mmCIF file of C-alpha atoms and ligand atoms in Angstrom:
data_model
loop_
_atom_site.group_PDB
_atom_site.id
_atom_site.type_symbol
_atom_site.label_atom_id
_atom_site.label_comp_id
_atom_site.label_asym_id
_atom_site.label_seq_id
_atom_site.Cartn_x
_atom_site.Cartn_y
_atom_site.Cartn_z
ATOM 1 C CA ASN A 13 -92.780 22.549 54.333
ATOM 2 C CA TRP A 14 -92.984 19.085 56.037
ATOM 3 C CA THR A 15 -90.470 17.277 53.899
ATOM 4 C CA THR A 16 -86.955 15.863 53.992
ATOM 5 C CA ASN A 21 -82.262 25.536 49.367
ATOM 6 C CA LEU A 22 -81.516 26.120 53.028
ATOM 7 C CA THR A 23 -78.726 25.870 55.560
ATOM 8 C CA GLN A 24 -78.814 22.910 57.943
ATOM 9 C CA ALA A 25 -79.870 25.245 60.766
ATOM 10 C CA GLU A 26 -82.603 26.820 58.628
ATOM 11 C CA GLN A 27 -83.926 23.400 57.665
ATOM 12 C CA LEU A 28 -83.949 22.177 61.259
ATOM 13 C CA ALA A 29 -85.628 25.370 62.536
ATOM 14 C CA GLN A 30 -88.437 25.082 59.996
ATOM 15 C CA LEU A 31 -89.054 21.410 60.804
ATOM 16 C CA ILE A 32 -89.177 22.049 64.520
ATOM 17 C CA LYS A 33 -91.632 24.929 63.997
ATOM 18 C CA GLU A 34 -93.863 22.771 61.820
ATOM 19 C CA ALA A 35 -93.872 19.622 63.974
ATOM 20 C CA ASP A 36 -96.965 18.624 65.991
ATOM 21 C CA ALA A 37 -94.675 17.011 68.548
ATOM 22 C CA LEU A 38 -91.039 16.119 69.177
ATOM 23 C CA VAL A 39 -89.626 12.825 70.400
ATOM 24 C CA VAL A 40 -86.000 13.681 71.171
ATOM 25 C CA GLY A 41 -83.345 10.990 71.558
ATOM 26 C CA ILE A 42 -80.034 12.169 73.018
ATOM 27 C CA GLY A 43 -76.797 10.238 72.996
ATOM 28 C CA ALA A 44 -73.170 10.729 73.940
ATOM 29 C CA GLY A 45 -72.472 13.007 70.937
ATOM 30 C CA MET A 46 -74.413 15.869 72.490
ATOM 31 C CA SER A 47 -72.311 15.817 75.674
ATOM 32 C CA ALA A 48 -69.077 15.356 73.651
ATOM 33 C CA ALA A 49 -70.036 18.383 71.520
ATOM 34 C CA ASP A 50 -70.079 20.512 74.708
ATOM 35 C CA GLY A 51 -66.597 19.296 75.697
ATOM 36 C CA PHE A 52 -67.636 16.416 77.990
ATOM 37 C CA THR A 53 -65.456 13.903 76.166
ATOM 38 C CA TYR A 54 -64.526 10.294 77.018
ATOM 39 C CA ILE A 55 -61.184 10.088 75.232
ATOM 40 C CA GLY A 56 -58.174 12.394 74.975
ATOM 41 C CA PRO A 57 -56.836 14.883 77.541
ATOM 42 C CA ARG A 58 -60.035 15.096 79.597
ATOM 43 C CA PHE A 59 -59.665 11.344 80.317
ATOM 44 C CA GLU A 60 -55.851 11.394 80.483
ATOM 45 C CA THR A 61 -55.740 14.239 82.993
ATOM 46 C CA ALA A 62 -58.278 12.669 85.337
ATOM 47 C CA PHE A 63 -56.941 9.050 85.312
ATOM 48 C CA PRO A 64 -53.168 9.029 84.714
ATOM 49 C CA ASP A 65 -52.696 6.282 87.332
ATOM 50 C CA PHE A 66 -55.367 3.956 85.895
ATOM 51 C CA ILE A 67 -54.197 4.514 82.316
ATOM 52 C CA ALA A 68 -50.569 3.831 83.246
ATOM 53 C CA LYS A 69 -51.605 0.568 84.895
ATOM 54 C CA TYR A 70 -54.140 -0.842 82.404
ATOM 55 C CA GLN A 71 -53.361 0.958 79.089
ATOM 56 C CA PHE A 72 -57.007 2.144 78.736
ATOM 57 C CA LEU A 73 -57.715 3.968 75.500
ATOM 58 C CA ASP A 74 -60.839 5.738 76.679
ATOM 59 C CA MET A 75 -63.090 6.411 79.607
ATOM 60 C CA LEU A 76 -66.020 4.265 78.435
ATOM 61 C CA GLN A 77 -63.780 1.248 78.232
ATOM 62 C CA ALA A 78 -62.399 2.079 81.669
ATOM 63 C CA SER A 79 -65.869 2.487 83.199
ATOM 64 C CA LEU A 80 -66.871 -1.052 82.049
ATOM 65 C CA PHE A 81 -63.621 -2.758 83.055
ATOM 66 C CA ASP A 82 -63.749 -5.628 85.514
ATOM 67 C CA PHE A 83 -61.355 -4.337 88.150
ATOM 68 C CA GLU A 84 -59.345 -6.687 90.345
ATOM 69 C CA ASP A 85 -61.351 -5.875 93.469
ATOM 70 C CA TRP A 86 -64.086 -3.622 94.800
ATOM 71 C CA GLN A 87 -61.476 -1.340 96.382
ATOM 72 C CA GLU A 88 -60.112 -0.552 92.917
ATOM 73 C CA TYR A 89 -63.574 -0.431 91.325
ATOM 74 C CA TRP A 90 -64.667 2.280 93.762
ATOM 75 C CA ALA A 91 -61.400 4.159 93.459
ATOM 76 C CA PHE A 92 -62.093 4.490 89.749
ATOM 77 C CA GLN A 93 -65.866 5.028 89.878
ATOM 78 C CA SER A 94 -65.831 7.626 92.632
ATOM 79 C CA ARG A 95 -63.496 9.762 90.523
ATOM 80 C CA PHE A 96 -65.578 8.971 87.418
ATOM 81 C CA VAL A 97 -68.790 10.085 89.204
ATOM 82 C CA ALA A 98 -67.118 13.335 90.279
ATOM 83 C CA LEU A 99 -65.934 14.179 86.780
ATOM 84 C CA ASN A 100 -69.166 13.317 84.956
ATOM 85 C CA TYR A 101 -71.887 13.838 87.527
ATOM 86 C CA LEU A 102 -71.031 15.860 90.630
ATOM 87 C CA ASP A 103 -68.729 18.503 89.150
ATOM 88 C CA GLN A 104 -69.546 18.513 85.403
ATOM 89 C CA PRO A 105 -70.651 22.106 84.494
ATOM 90 C CA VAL A 106 -73.662 23.043 82.369
ATOM 91 C CA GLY A 107 -73.294 22.591 78.612
ATOM 92 C CA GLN A 108 -74.380 25.466 76.359
ATOM 93 C CA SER A 109 -75.999 23.119 73.791
ATOM 94 C CA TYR A 110 -78.289 21.782 76.543
ATOM 95 C CA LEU A 111 -79.338 25.359 77.319
ATOM 96 C CA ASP A 112 -79.872 26.155 73.609
ATOM 97 C CA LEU A 113 -81.960 23.010 73.101
ATOM 98 C CA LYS A 114 -84.072 23.857 76.148
ATOM 99 C CA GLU A 115 -84.923 27.326 74.765
ATOM 100 C CA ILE A 116 -86.150 25.725 71.529
ATOM 101 C CA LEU A 117 -88.172 22.972 73.232
ATOM 102 C CA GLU A 118 -90.028 25.363 75.592
ATOM 103 C CA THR A 119 -92.674 26.111 72.933
ATOM 104 C CA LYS A 120 -93.084 22.493 71.727
ATOM 105 C CA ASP A 121 -94.833 19.386 73.043
ATOM 106 C CA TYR A 122 -91.910 17.045 73.529
ATOM 107 C CA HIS A 123 -90.389 14.218 75.433
ATOM 108 C CA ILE A 124 -86.721 13.269 75.808
ATOM 109 C CA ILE A 125 -85.239 9.784 75.896
ATOM 110 C CA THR A 126 -81.506 9.655 76.620
ATOM 111 C CA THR A 127 -78.852 6.965 76.871
ATOM 112 C CA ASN A 128 -76.617 9.471 78.694
ATOM 113 C CA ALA A 129 -76.060 8.975 82.388
ATOM 114 C CA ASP A 130 -74.306 12.278 83.240
ATOM 115 C CA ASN A 131 -75.766 15.374 84.988
ATOM 116 C CA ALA A 132 -76.294 17.438 81.794
ATOM 117 C CA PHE A 133 -80.083 17.762 81.950
ATOM 118 C CA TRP A 134 -80.145 18.607 85.678
ATOM 119 C CA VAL A 135 -77.566 21.406 85.625
ATOM 120 C CA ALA A 136 -79.396 22.780 82.553
ATOM 121 C CA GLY A 137 -82.664 22.857 84.563
ATOM 122 C CA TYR A 138 -84.850 20.510 82.505
ATOM 123 C CA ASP A 139 -88.065 19.264 84.093
ATOM 124 C CA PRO A 140 -87.363 15.649 85.227
ATOM 125 C CA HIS A 141 -90.859 14.566 84.141
ATOM 126 C CA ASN A 142 -89.936 15.237 80.481
ATOM 127 C CA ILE A 143 -86.812 13.019 80.422
ATOM 128 C CA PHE A 144 -86.416 9.226 80.397
ATOM 129 C CA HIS A 145 -82.927 8.017 81.504
ATOM 130 C CA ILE A 146 -83.146 4.578 80.006
ATOM 131 C CA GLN A 147 -79.475 3.731 80.897
ATOM 132 C CA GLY A 148 -79.678 4.967 84.505
ATOM 133 C CA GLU A 149 -77.554 7.700 86.091
ATOM 134 C CA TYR A 150 -74.019 7.766 87.474
ATOM 135 C CA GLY A 151 -75.186 9.416 90.691
ATOM 136 C CA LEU A 152 -77.212 6.314 91.587
ATOM 137 C CA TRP A 153 -76.179 2.935 93.019
ATOM 138 C CA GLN A 154 -77.601 -0.569 92.735
ATOM 139 C CA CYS A 155 -76.920 -3.890 94.408
ATOM 140 C CA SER A 156 -74.147 -5.703 92.539
ATOM 141 C CA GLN A 157 -76.325 -8.830 92.768
ATOM 142 C CA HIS A 158 -79.460 -6.931 91.695
ATOM 143 C CA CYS A 159 -81.182 -8.606 94.675
ATOM 144 C CA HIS A 160 -83.962 -5.992 94.782
ATOM 145 C CA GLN A 161 -85.243 -3.228 92.482
ATOM 146 C CA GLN A 162 -84.185 -0.116 94.434
ATOM 147 C CA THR A 163 -81.520 2.515 93.690
ATOM 148 C CA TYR A 164 -79.565 4.426 96.313
ATOM 149 C CA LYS A 165 -77.397 7.509 96.426
ATOM 150 C CA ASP A 166 -74.816 9.166 98.675
ATOM 151 C CA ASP A 167 -72.669 11.945 97.173
ATOM 152 C CA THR A 168 -70.878 12.411 100.517
ATOM 153 C CA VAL A 169 -69.464 8.891 100.281
ATOM 154 C CA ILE A 170 -68.331 9.517 96.702
ATOM 155 C CA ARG A 171 -66.376 12.562 97.975
ATOM 156 C CA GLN A 172 -64.847 10.516 100.829
ATOM 157 C CA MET A 173 -63.734 7.854 98.397
ATOM 158 C CA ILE A 174 -61.987 10.460 96.262
ATOM 159 C CA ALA A 175 -60.326 12.048 99.299
ATOM 160 C CA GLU A 176 -59.384 8.810 101.111
ATOM 161 C CA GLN A 177 -58.217 6.569 98.237
ATOM 162 C CA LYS A 178 -54.510 5.896 97.809
ATOM 163 C CA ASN A 179 -52.634 4.063 95.106
ATOM 164 C CA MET A 180 -55.902 3.317 93.265
ATOM 165 C CA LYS A 181 -57.666 1.730 96.273
ATOM 166 C CA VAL A 182 -60.444 3.010 98.517
ATOM 167 C CA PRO A 183 -60.084 1.907 102.152
ATOM 168 C CA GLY A 184 -62.136 -1.250 102.816
ATOM 169 C CA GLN A 185 -64.477 0.365 105.347
ATOM 170 C CA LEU A 186 -65.702 2.941 102.792
ATOM 171 C CA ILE A 187 -67.059 0.382 100.297
ATOM 172 C CA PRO A 188 -70.849 0.685 100.611
ATOM 173 C CA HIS A 189 -72.947 -2.500 100.864
ATOM 174 C CA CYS A 190 -76.489 -3.500 99.915
ATOM 175 C CA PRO A 191 -78.575 -3.479 103.118
ATOM 176 C CA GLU A 192 -80.617 -6.515 101.957
ATOM 177 C CA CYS A 193 -77.914 -8.977 100.883
ATOM 178 C CA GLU A 194 -74.622 -7.345 101.998
ATOM 179 C CA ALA A 195 -73.105 -7.504 98.495
ATOM 180 C CA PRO A 196 -71.227 -4.318 97.521
ATOM 181 C CA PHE A 197 -73.107 -1.492 95.816
ATOM 182 C CA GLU A 198 -72.081 -0.769 92.215
ATOM 183 C CA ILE A 199 -73.016 2.138 89.909
ATOM 184 C CA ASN A 200 -76.531 2.009 88.450
ATOM 185 C CA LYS A 201 -75.514 0.902 84.928
ATOM 186 C CA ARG A 202 -77.052 -1.412 82.346
ATOM 187 C CA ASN A 203 -75.277 -4.575 81.274
ATOM 188 C CA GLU A 204 -76.170 -7.020 78.472
ATOM 189 C CA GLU A 205 -75.788 -10.078 80.728
ATOM 190 C CA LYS A 206 -77.210 -8.761 84.035
ATOM 191 C CA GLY A 207 -79.494 -5.956 82.785
ATOM 192 C CA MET A 208 -80.037 -3.065 85.194
ATOM 193 C CA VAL A 209 -81.889 -2.479 88.430
ATOM 194 C CA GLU A 210 -85.066 -0.711 87.392
ATOM 195 C CA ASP A 211 -86.829 0.836 90.385
ATOM 196 C CA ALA A 212 -90.112 2.711 90.889
ATOM 197 C CA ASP A 213 -88.691 6.009 89.559
ATOM 198 C CA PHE A 214 -87.352 4.255 86.422
ATOM 199 C CA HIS A 215 -90.750 2.716 85.732
ATOM 200 C CA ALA A 216 -92.470 6.082 86.257
ATOM 201 C CA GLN A 217 -90.185 7.702 83.658
ATOM 202 C CA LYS A 218 -90.783 4.791 81.282
ATOM 203 C CA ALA A 219 -94.565 5.068 81.651
ATOM 204 C CA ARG A 220 -94.435 8.825 81.047
ATOM 205 C CA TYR A 221 -92.368 8.227 77.890
ATOM 206 C CA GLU A 222 -94.706 5.461 76.742
ATOM 207 C CA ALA A 223 -97.763 7.690 77.392
ATOM 208 C CA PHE A 224 -96.282 10.484 75.269
ATOM 209 C CA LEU A 225 -95.640 7.987 72.433
ATOM 210 C CA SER A 226 -99.215 6.640 72.711
ATOM 211 C CA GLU A 227 -100.521 10.196 72.265
ATOM 212 C CA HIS A 228 -98.421 10.840 69.171
ATOM 213 C CA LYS A 229 -98.836 7.723 67.052
ATOM 214 C CA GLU A 230 -100.264 9.936 64.307
ATOM 215 C CA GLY A 231 -99.458 13.327 62.798
ATOM 216 C CA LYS A 232 -96.350 15.360 62.109
ATOM 217 C CA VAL A 233 -94.115 13.915 64.769
ATOM 218 C CA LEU A 234 -90.449 14.742 64.564
ATOM 219 C CA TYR A 235 -88.105 12.049 65.826
ATOM 220 C CA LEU A 236 -84.968 14.022 66.507
ATOM 221 C CA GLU A 237 -81.896 11.884 67.189
ATOM 222 C CA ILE A 238 -78.890 13.836 68.473
ATOM 223 C CA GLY A 239 -75.405 12.358 68.762
ATOM 224 C CA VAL A 240 -76.536 8.740 68.768
ATOM 225 C CA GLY A 241 -74.180 6.141 67.293
ATOM 226 C CA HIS A 242 -73.613 2.378 67.178
ATOM 227 C CA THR A 243 -72.560 1.562 70.737
ATOM 228 C CA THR A 244 -76.187 0.706 71.805
ATOM 229 C CA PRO A 245 -78.571 1.395 68.912
ATOM 230 C CA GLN A 246 -81.321 -0.787 70.399
ATOM 231 C CA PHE A 247 -82.330 2.002 72.826
ATOM 232 C CA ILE A 248 -82.931 5.074 70.661
ATOM 233 C CA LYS A 249 -81.847 4.564 67.046
ATOM 234 C CA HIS A 250 -83.740 1.356 66.125
ATOM 235 C CA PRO A 251 -86.949 2.217 68.030
ATOM 236 C CA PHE A 252 -87.032 5.657 66.322
ATOM 237 C CA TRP A 253 -86.606 4.008 62.899
ATOM 238 C CA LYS A 254 -89.570 1.807 63.677
ATOM 239 C CA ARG A 255 -91.781 4.631 64.892
ATOM 240 C CA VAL A 256 -91.122 6.576 61.683
ATOM 241 C CA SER A 257 -91.856 3.540 59.513
ATOM 242 C CA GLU A 258 -95.156 3.059 61.417
ATOM 243 C CA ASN A 259 -96.301 6.699 60.911
ATOM 244 C CA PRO A 260 -96.066 7.935 57.268
ATOM 245 C CA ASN A 261 -96.411 11.529 58.473
ATOM 246 C CA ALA A 262 -93.475 11.315 60.929
ATOM 247 C CA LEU A 263 -89.930 12.421 60.145
ATOM 248 C CA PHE A 264 -86.536 11.091 61.217
ATOM 249 C CA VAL A 265 -83.886 13.746 61.610
ATOM 250 C CA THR A 266 -80.480 12.789 62.921
ATOM 251 C CA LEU A 267 -77.825 15.286 63.985
ATOM 252 C CA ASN A 268 -74.606 13.356 63.531
ATOM 253 C CA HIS A 269 -71.322 14.219 61.783
ATOM 254 C CA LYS A 270 -71.142 10.534 60.704
ATOM 255 C CA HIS A 271 -73.543 8.839 58.271
ATOM 256 C CA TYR A 272 -75.426 5.748 59.524
ATOM 257 C CA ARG A 273 -77.389 3.914 56.847
ATOM 258 C CA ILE A 274 -81.120 4.419 57.178
ATOM 259 C CA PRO A 275 -83.554 1.562 56.395
ATOM 260 C CA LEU A 276 -85.482 1.450 53.133
ATOM 261 C CA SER A 277 -88.872 1.879 54.826
ATOM 262 C CA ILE A 278 -88.014 5.429 55.968
ATOM 263 C CA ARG A 279 -85.695 6.670 53.200
ATOM 264 C CA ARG A 280 -88.248 9.323 52.178
ATOM 265 C CA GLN A 281 -88.889 10.452 55.782
ATOM 266 C CA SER A 282 -85.277 11.041 56.811
ATOM 267 C CA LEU A 283 -82.864 13.970 56.998
ATOM 268 C CA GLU A 284 -79.269 13.813 58.148
ATOM 269 C CA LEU A 285 -77.603 16.999 59.404
ATOM 270 C CA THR A 286 -73.827 16.700 59.673
ATOM 271 C CA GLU A 287 -72.743 20.026 61.209
ATOM 272 C CA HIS A 288 -71.076 20.007 64.637
ATOM 273 C CA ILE A 289 -73.989 19.583 67.090
ATOM 274 C CA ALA A 290 -73.060 22.510 69.350
ATOM 275 C CA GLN A 291 -72.820 25.002 66.455
ATOM 276 C CA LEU A 292 -75.871 23.543 64.748
ATOM 277 C CA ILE A 293 -78.078 23.745 67.866
ATOM 278 C CA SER A 294 -76.865 27.303 68.534
ATOM 279 C CA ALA A 295 -77.611 28.532 64.965
ATOM 280 C CA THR A 296 -80.991 26.762 64.952
ATOM 281 C CA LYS A 297 -81.920 28.487 68.218
ATOM 282 C CA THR A 298 -81.072 31.919 66.776
ATOM 283 C CA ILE A 299 -83.244 31.288 63.689
ATOM 284 C CA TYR A 300 -86.097 29.640 65.599
ATOM 285 C CA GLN A 301 -86.424 32.516 68.076
ATOM 286 C CA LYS A 302 -87.025 35.108 65.306
HETATM 287 N N1 LIG B 1 -72.353 11.112 78.484
HETATM 288 C C1 LIG B 1 -72.626 9.852 78.858
HETATM 289 O O1 LIG B 1 -73.377 9.647 79.803
HETATM 290 C C2 LIG B 1 -72.023 8.686 78.093
HETATM 291 C C3 LIG B 1 -70.797 8.816 77.436
HETATM 292 C C4 LIG B 1 -70.276 7.728 76.735
HETATM 293 C C5 LIG B 1 -70.978 6.528 76.703
HETATM 294 N N2 LIG B 1 -72.163 6.402 77.331
HETATM 295 C C6 LIG B 1 -72.883 5.099 77.279
HETATM 296 O O2 LIG B 1 -72.428 4.255 76.212
HETATM 297 C C7 LIG B 1 -73.350 4.254 75.124
HETATM 298 C C8 LIG B 1 -72.937 5.317 74.128
HETATM 299 O O3 LIG B 1 -73.811 5.275 73.007
HETATM 300 P P1 LIG B 1 -74.216 6.600 72.188
HETATM 301 O O4 LIG B 1 -75.069 6.198 71.010
HETATM 302 O O5 LIG B 1 -74.805 7.592 73.164
HETATM 303 O O6 LIG B 1 -72.819 7.273 71.693
HETATM 304 P P2 LIG B 1 -71.760 6.732 70.591
HETATM 305 O O7 LIG B 1 -70.425 7.149 71.102
HETATM 306 O O8 LIG B 1 -72.091 5.330 70.188
HETATM 307 O O9 LIG B 1 -72.115 7.663 69.361
HETATM 308 C C9 LIG B 1 -71.951 9.079 69.468
HETATM 309 C C10 LIG B 1 -72.327 9.679 68.124
HETATM 310 O O10 LIG B 1 -72.275 11.105 68.176
HETATM 311 C C11 LIG B 1 -71.526 11.577 67.052
HETATM 312 N N3 LIG B 1 -70.882 12.847 67.432
HETATM 313 C C12 LIG B 1 -69.949 13.015 68.384
HETATM 314 N N4 LIG B 1 -69.611 14.319 68.482
HETATM 315 C C13 LIG B 1 -70.360 14.993 67.579
HETATM 316 C C14 LIG B 1 -70.515 16.396 67.148
HETATM 317 N N5 LIG B 1 -69.779 17.366 67.729
HETATM 318 N N6 LIG B 1 -71.405 16.693 66.177
HETATM 319 C C15 LIG B 1 -72.138 15.734 65.589
HETATM 320 N N7 LIG B 1 -72.046 14.424 65.931
HETATM 321 C C16 LIG B 1 -71.194 14.010 66.896
HETATM 322 C C17 LIG B 1 -70.572 10.464 66.670
HETATM 323 O O11 LIG B 1 -70.272 10.535 65.277
HETATM 324 C C18 LIG B 1 -71.357 9.217 67.033
HETATM 325 O O12 LIG B 1 -72.115 8.728 65.926
HETATM 326 C C19 LIG B 1 -74.704 4.573 75.713
HETATM 327 O O13 LIG B 1 -75.459 3.367 75.868
HETATM 328 C C20 LIG B 1 -74.386 5.249 77.041
HETATM 329 O O14 LIG B 1 -75.127 4.659 78.117
HETATM 330 C C21 LIG B 1 -72.679 7.450 78.027
HETATM 331 ZN ZN1 LIG B 2 -78.450 -6.860 97.539
#
């Protein structure tokens, strides 16, 4: 039973049923599987002006670009926040996953910063947004550990911008140091503003892990790649190595080489995440 000839969905369903607890790591693949993609027509349709000017290949690259000024930065980011946070509809795979998780003891860690868990109605106390959220702002100088939000201003920036610039007076500023706000995002050089809410999520996640150091714990990694493996992928590998009774299951249509220590505790399921989660739900429910 607890081991790594069945379909992928059958195998996953059985493992979930058997597990004492689930630690679920969710990356960009899960949102891309529901159509919330960062390259191709979705990106091209939303940012024809920015693409024509800078020859951006994809939306992740664009979102990290050092724009000429803050007027251009906010012209891009306001539209980016609308597409991926304010107006992004619920994804069916997030609903399917939620139905499965209802009967399990679980916690989610995610590197995603979109709205996907909120529009799907997950309990915020069960989710750790380790890379922040696009709907939040931070001081560009990180002068104090507090995040801010104002969706009304985001809408005004979309409405009022022209020729890829927001009007000067709409750029929001840090009330402590007067530097411009930027999106709450993590950066290798500067890090990320990590406020009281962030630390509360982190503590909740860490408490869950402290409770499940032993037993049949399923570390379920969904749509996590090589862009930032230090957040979910590597820590999960280490957890599984540390607990001989744990399993590592990754839902990814690409194969990432698993370390020697956990070769016997690993399963890789390659089917398209959306279809896989859907078929697993159907089997699990019965
Ligand atoms: N939705 C978001 O919020 C978003 C989107 C892009 C990037 N980011 C940021 O950039 C980094 C991205 O890293 P990452 O590891 O999350 O993503 P990644 O792009 O590095 O890896 C995504 C993985 O999912 C797989 N995948 C994609 N579609 C799939 C499908 N239909 N079925 C099965 N597998 C599929 C890919 O093969 C890939 O291995 C994160 O740190 C994050 O903060 C966030
Ligand atoms: Zn400041």
